[PDB]
Amino acid sequence: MRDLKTYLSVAPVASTLWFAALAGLLIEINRFFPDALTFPFF
Amino acid sequence: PEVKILVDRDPIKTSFEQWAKPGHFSRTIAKGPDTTTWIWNLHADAHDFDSHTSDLEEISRKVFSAHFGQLSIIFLWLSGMYFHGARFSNYEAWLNDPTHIRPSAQVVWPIVGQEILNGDVGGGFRGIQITSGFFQIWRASGITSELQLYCTAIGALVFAALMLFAGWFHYHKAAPKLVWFQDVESMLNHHLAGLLGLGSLSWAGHQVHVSLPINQFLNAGVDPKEIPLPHEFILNRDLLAQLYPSFAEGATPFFTLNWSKYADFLTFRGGLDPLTGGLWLTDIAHHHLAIAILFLIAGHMYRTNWGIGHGIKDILEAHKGPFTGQGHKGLYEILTTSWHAQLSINLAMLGSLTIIVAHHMYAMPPYPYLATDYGTQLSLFTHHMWIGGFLIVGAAAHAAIFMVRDYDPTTRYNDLLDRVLRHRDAIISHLNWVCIFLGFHSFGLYIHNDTMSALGRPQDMFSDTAIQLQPVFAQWIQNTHALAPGTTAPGATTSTSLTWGGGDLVSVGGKVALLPIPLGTADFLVHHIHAFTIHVTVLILLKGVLFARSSRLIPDKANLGFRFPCDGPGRGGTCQVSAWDHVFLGLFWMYNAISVVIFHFSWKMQSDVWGSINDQGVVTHITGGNFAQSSITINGWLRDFLWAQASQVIQSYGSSLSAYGLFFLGAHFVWAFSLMFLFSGRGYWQELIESIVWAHNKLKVAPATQPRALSIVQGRAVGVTHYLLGGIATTWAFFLARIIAVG
Amino acid sequence: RPLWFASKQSLSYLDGSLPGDYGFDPLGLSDPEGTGGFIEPRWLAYGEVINGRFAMLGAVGAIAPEYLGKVGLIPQETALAWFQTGVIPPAGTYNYWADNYTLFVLEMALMGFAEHRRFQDWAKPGSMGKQYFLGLEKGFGGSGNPAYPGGPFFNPLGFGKDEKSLKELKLKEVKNGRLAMLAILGYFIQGLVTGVGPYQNLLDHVADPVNNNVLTSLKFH
Amino acid sequence: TVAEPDRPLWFPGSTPPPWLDGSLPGDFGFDPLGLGSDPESLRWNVQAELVHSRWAMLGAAGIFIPEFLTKLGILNTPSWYTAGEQEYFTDTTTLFIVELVFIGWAEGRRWADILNPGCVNTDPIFPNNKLTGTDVGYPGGLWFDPLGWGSASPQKLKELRTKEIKNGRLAMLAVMGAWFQHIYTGTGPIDNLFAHLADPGHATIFAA
Amino acid sequence: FIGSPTNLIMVTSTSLMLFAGRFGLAPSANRKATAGLKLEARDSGLQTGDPAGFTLADTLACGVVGHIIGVGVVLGLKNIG
Ligand code: CLA
Ligand code: CLA
Ligand code: CLA
Ligand SMILES: CC1=C[C@H](O)CC(C)(C)[C@H]1/C=C/C(C)=C/C=C/C(C)=C/C=C/C=C(C)/C=C/C=C(C)/C=C/C1=C(C)C[C@H](O)CC1(C)C
Ligand code: SF4
Ligand SMILES: [Ca+2]
């Protein structure tokens, strides 16, 4: 468990998880507001 | 002396301690990172087992377990294939009308407007067309519904899990001992008979029961869903009796040696099936039966435990003549104590085998409705060609690694290797001369033709209408092949392939499957170009292997190791003297050779083979036979091949093939990017990184792990990797777009 | 002590300490030398004994229903061959009080309890006489030898108070297990090629020896 | 803590993990993956199991008693699975938000106590109340323990807590089973029980 | 189909090959082959009951090769006559 946590935070694994989360977030934002070329709210 | 099962219990206990420590294998790496270079090293030596330790037993155990892991990966890949075919494919629609529907087994979710890639492939389906040729394999196997594909996918997943567990269990619970790995006689006996022979017998048994009756029903016109299930043909035997009467007697012809009675489904026809455009399945079943017999016999050669057999040492040491001293004496000990020797031999053989597979597979198509699927044919040929070339280059890499590391005349002395190392200078000098001579006469003729055409002197050109260079030998050989059936090979009705001759063009669904391929002056020139490129790459690789240990420049090159940047700017400069650098150059030359080979194949097929048949039998070829007259000059290759056929890929924007144009441009980019690494040195980059690091130090944001520039060898490796990726990917996109739009 | 087709290397580790030891190990699987997972000699002996026991059960059982199906009140529909009971649904099924699949799950739960307890006894001998189990654990102690646990449950009649009786009884047990085991192999292959059933096959063969093995080589199904 | 070397085990004949020494209520040594090895993680998991158990016991009661009650013509609770959309006095979102703030307050109090034991037992409005419970996960007090049934000897409280955790595990499995049944079948848990009891041999999983 | 030309040919072939194997005439399990001219004597490990050291592996191998040669001869003869 402790060693699993340690290995699960090593550079490659942490980076892949971070970028998967970022990709999912951006994908969902684009899905809800697609084809957005300007900021119209204000 | 005897062959038995030897293992050791619990050599390594499964745990997570070493996961937390990056690079446990190397002591200095285990200590920790001082600079960023460390990180790269950690990956560069991940699978270099023979360097982390020196015990043969540990290396062998690691190799066995890694083999299990890779086998698990392959099984997972196959399970993914079968699942995608089962769920995200139009396999049944294609099965109902093969020539009508374009195979596809991949859809893309609609997220950022990428749904344009879900093109109209037919059969009420929208997806990405696949050129892997899986649909033809499934049709040839007798798969008719998606339930069978689902079952195969689940089974492959289970076998992937089993492979993974086997790897874990064999490395951590029961690790075979060294004497077990060194038992090569029994290994060869089992692989020849237990694996190849028995596997071929099993596949022949499947083909007799499932492939033959199912494909016969399919070709008779029965709808796929109305066909009896593959198991019924086993329960009730009259089902088989109807298609082939000889099943009525059942096995008694096989045991009374009345094998002629099995001529119904065990034939020697040859050629192609006029309906499906592939090899007769009754020929393939007989093929696999004969192969099974041959391998089951050949796997009884080497002695294991019962006296009868052959000792490989005896066979090796019994061969030697006046020109080679005591040759073959000592090779058995070399090949059973060094893994790199075996790896190099096997890599060379597998690369050659893959190349031969490509050649034979486009020569006579073995799957139904594969010949007229031009995209599949082109993609399969090109893929196998590239795989074979890479494996052959790896053969040289590992031969050089063995030469540097495991070669030792004090303890393991071989006579043939000694003589080769003693006249390497003559070998390489003559090979260099051959390379120069071939280069001048193959490419020089192209330059001559180009210059004559530019000067308005077509009568002086080396063409079919000016000065002919007819390959008389190849023409004679293929003529002898055309006349073969009924003369020299009486039992065959049709020639081995339709490329030999004899006319008998074969077409399917209005498309040309195959017809005789003519050989002329352009074929002569391109074949000599092929010979030139192969010889030059062989020169590079052989020179790297032979001069790996020492030369007249650096007499102690072995002490530096297999991989190292140089030996300083002394003696005029010793850049790229190591064997690894020779492999690095051989990669470029292999890329050149394979690119020319695939270009020749594509243009020749389009010009003289592929095309559309019409009612009167007038064949209109994709390219109107311009290869014979345009391929003899470089300007023709640049204009009538690259420029003309790039239109399909460059226009792909706005359609389902837009991804191919995107990959075309991206591959161009990555290839040009590689030149950044291939042309520069690390000193400039380190000096620039110094200023960057200072800029970071000014803001208290400098990394603790000091950022060093890439090592020299790493710079070369990155350059070659990017070069190969970019070139191969741009050719991939070009071929796929061209043949999908025009095919 | 007679030996059949033994090997000098096999004679080394096959000395006679196990019942039915005829020195027959040309293959050499029982290597100790090489000892490993599931290849350890004691595990192999245990597997031989257990497989022989199950095969004896299955050989007396698979032949029974189609025997008394000819003699006795037993219903005609109830008596079928060992392959038509629903073991191989393609070859025939039957309608019991359950689905054939829930039957499998129930069989599996019960057999799992039994076999898990047996194995946990094999690994750490005598470990099943400790934890509670509605009582009955004092009878699940064991006897050191896993293949022969004994006790009030597995040996209530108290056969073989002396040791020789046990020795010869073990010899008879292993011989009968091998016999029934090879006989079940015969069951399988006969029912495959001949497809009639073992008892009816015996009856039609004993009418006259016209029904040879070579006769069935035509292979109807 | 009373470490019981010879407690009954989940897998008879196998040694329990070192980190499970029988201190916790309802310890049978079940930790194949070894998730709770780290002491702090062990405490966190114990709290998680307790809260999951209590939530699941409430859920099992409120899913099964009402439907066993409406199967017999006593009252008319609808199907639990589809009970989320039947419109009430207001829309579901407002109820969700108002419920969210309240349960967030309660869970924040619980979190503060978990990560700092005995630091939130006093009522912030009237500082003369004080929850009596001195154990993390067992607040006690007049609110969560008005009857004071479980304040006697530690040994008695130990087995009472074991009863609690065992009933909780059963409830968790029960609720998950009800969910999986309603998604697999298309009826209610009481309907499934009645059908299976009518045909114990054929009305099972293998009916599809 | 018993006693027929094919059965007789296969019999005689297998019987002759096995007879050669049991005696000299061929490379037995206990008899090494030098270069196809002389046969040396060795002990393969597995013990034999037959006086001439004819092991079970030896008889299996001799039978198998006898069947191979018989099948070849019979098939050729039936192919031409
Ligand atoms: C399932 C649990 C498990 C656990 C806890 C361990 C634990 C351990 N193993 Mg082990 N192993 C396992 C399963 C396991 N293994 C299996 C299933 C196999 C068969 C393949 C092996 C075969 C094996 C070998 C041969 C060796 C070890 C070694 C080790 C030790 C060194 C660190 C390490 O694991 O490497 C690092 C951990 C990783 C996760 C590395 C990644 C490896 C996977 C296979 C990559 C997946 C490939 C991927 C698809 C590539 C495509 C890339 C793409 C995704 C971009 C360590 C104690 C080494 C050792 O003991 O040193 C003396 C040793 O040499 N293991
Ligand atoms: C079964 C085939 C096989 C096997 C088992 C091996 C095994 C081995 N090779 Mg070898 N090799 C092979 C084929 C093979 N090779 C072939 C075909 C070639 C010709 C290309 C080479 C050329 C070669 C060289 C030059 C060297 C080795 C070396 C080694 C050893 C260490 C490799 C390592 O772990 O470094 C680390 C491995 C990596 C860092 C992985 C590289 C990742 C590649 C470049 C990316 C691939 C890109 C992908 C295909 C597409 C893009 C995806 C991306 C965008 C996400 C190891 C024992 C090294 C050695 O020292 O020998 C002792 C070494 O110097 N090999
Ligand atoms: C936790 C107690 C529990 C109980 C008493 C039941 C009882 C029942 N279930 Mg159910 N089930 C449970 C949990 C439980 N389930 C869980 C956790 C799941 C999720 C996997 C399911 C999923 C499930 C499905 C999908 C179905 C049932 C069905 C049924 C009914 C017929 C049995 C059957 O064929 O399905 C077999 C159920 C299983 C194999 C899963 C049970 C395994 C868990 C771990 C419980 C083990 C029992 C435990 C050791 C002893 C219980 C104590 C006491 C009550 C005796 C039956 C009345 C079927 C039905 O509706 O009837 C037609 C049905 O379709 N269950
Ligand atoms: C030893 C060795 C070693 C050396 O070295 C070499 C060699 C020689 C190779 C070898 C060999 C071996 C062998 C051959 C073995 C065999 C075995 C078997 C057969 C088993 C069975 C085994 C068998 C078994 C268990 C069985 C069991 C059975 C059972 C349960 C049954 C059940 C049943 C019945 C009743 C009937 C019904 O209706 C159905 C069922 C339900 C099905
Ligand atoms: S330029 Fe680089 S590779 Fe060449 S001698 Fe100098 S350091 Fe070595
Ligand atoms: Ca051994």
UniProtKB/TrEMBL annotation, chain A:
Keyword Magnesium on entry: no
Pfam families noted in UniProt: PSI_PsaJ (PF01701)
BP terms from Gene Ontology: photosynthesis
Gene Ontology CC terms, in alphabetical order: chloroplast thylakoid membrane; photosystem I
This protein's record includes keyword Protein biosynthesis: no
Protein name: Photosystem I reaction center subunit IX
Subcellular location: Plastid, Chloroplast thylakoid membrane
Provenance organism: Pisum sativum
Keyword vocabulary terms for this entry: Chloroplast, Membrane, Photosynthesis, Photosystem I, Plastid, Thylakoid, Transmembrane, Transmembrane helix
SUPFAM superfamilies assigned: Subunit IX of photosystem I reaction centre, PsaJ
InterPro entries, alphabetized: PSI_PsaJ, PSI_PsaJ_sf
Purpose of the protein: May help in the organization of the PsaE and PsaF subunits.
TM regions (residue ranges): 6-27
Top-rank taxon, per record: Eukaryota
Binding positions (chlorophyll a): E28, R31
Gene designation: psaJ
Topological category with respect to the lipid bilayer: Single-pass membrane protein
Family (UniProt): Belongs to the PsaJ family.
UniProtKB/TrEMBL annotation, chain B:
Positions annotated to bind chlorophyll a 1: Y171
Chain sites annotated for binding chlorophyll a 30: H360
Residues that hold chlorophyll a 9 according to the record: H67, H191
Annotated positions binding chlorophyll a 13: H84, W109
Positions annotated to bind chlorophyll a 44: Q714, H722
Annotated residues for binding of chlorophyll a 38: H481, T488
Residue positions binding chlorophyll a 33: W589
Reaction catalysed by this enzyme: reduced [plastocyanin] + hnu + oxidized [2Fe-2S]-[ferredoxin] = oxidized [plastocyanin] + reduced [2Fe-2S]-[ferredoxin]
Subcellular location, principal: membrane
Residues annotated for chlorophyll a 28 binding in this entry: H209
Residues given in the record as chlorophyll a 10 binding sites: H67, N346
Binding site for chlorophyll a 34: H448, R457
EC number in record: 1.97.1.12
Residue positions binding chlorophyll a 41: H535
Chain sites annotated for binding chlorophyll a 25: W203
Sites where the protein binds chlorophyll a 23: N189, H300, T304
UniProt: chlorophyll a 26 binding residues: W203, Q207, H288
Summary of the function given for this chain in its UniProt record: PsaA and PsaB bind P700, the primary electron donor of photosystem I (PSI), as well as the electron acceptors A0, A1 and FX. PSI is a plastocyanin-ferredoxin oxidoreductase, converting photonic excitation into a charge separation, which transfers an electron from the donor P700 chlorophyll pair to the spectroscopically characterized acceptors A0, A1, FX, FA and FB in turn. Oxidized P700 is reduced on the lumenal side of the thylakoid membrane by plastocyanin.
Descriptive protein name: Photosystem I P700 chlorophyll a apoprotein A1
Automatic annotation (TrEMBL), chain D:
Name of the gene: lhaB
Binding site for chlorophyll a 16: E107, R110
Binding site for chlorophyll a 18: R109
Portion of the full-length sequence here: 58 to 265 of 269
Residues that bind chlorophyll a 30: Q181, I205
Protein known as: Chlorophyll a-b binding protein, chloroplastic
UniProt binding sites for all-trans-violaxanthin: D31, L33, W80
Species whose genome carries this gene: Pisum sativum (Garden pea)
Binding site for chlorophyll a 8: E107
Binding annotation for chlorophyll a 7: H52, E107, R110
Binding residue positions for chlorophyll a 25: K166
UniProt binding sites for chlorophyll b 2: W10
Amino acids binding chlorophyll a 3: F28, N45, E49, R169
Residues reported to bind chlorophyll b 1: W10, R54
Binding-site residues, chlorophyll b 3: R54, R109
Binding site for chlorophyll a 4: F28, G29, F30, N45, E49, K163, R169
GO cellular component, one term: chloroplast thylakoid membrane
Residues annotated as binding chlorophyll a 6: W44, H52
Automatic annotation (TrEMBL), chain E:
A single cellular component GO annotation: chloroplast thylakoid membrane
Keywords per UniProt: Chloroplast, Membrane, Photosynthesis, Photosystem I, Plastid, Thylakoid, Transit peptide, Transmembrane, Transmembrane helix
Amino-acid positions noted as binding chlorophyll a 2 in the UniProt annotation, renumbered to this chain: H67
GO biological process, one term: photosynthesis
Membrane topology field: Multi-pass membrane protein
Cell compartment(s), UniProt: Plastid, Chloroplast thylakoid membrane
Main location: plastid
Binding residues annotated for chlorophyll a 3, in chain numbering: R22, D50
Chain residues that bind chlorophyll a 1: N7, H67
UniProt-annotated binding residues for chlorophyll a 4: R22, D50
Family from the record: Belongs to the PsaG/PsaK family.
Protein name as annotated: Photosystem I reaction center subunit psaK, chloroplastic
Organism per entry: Pisum sativum (Garden pea)
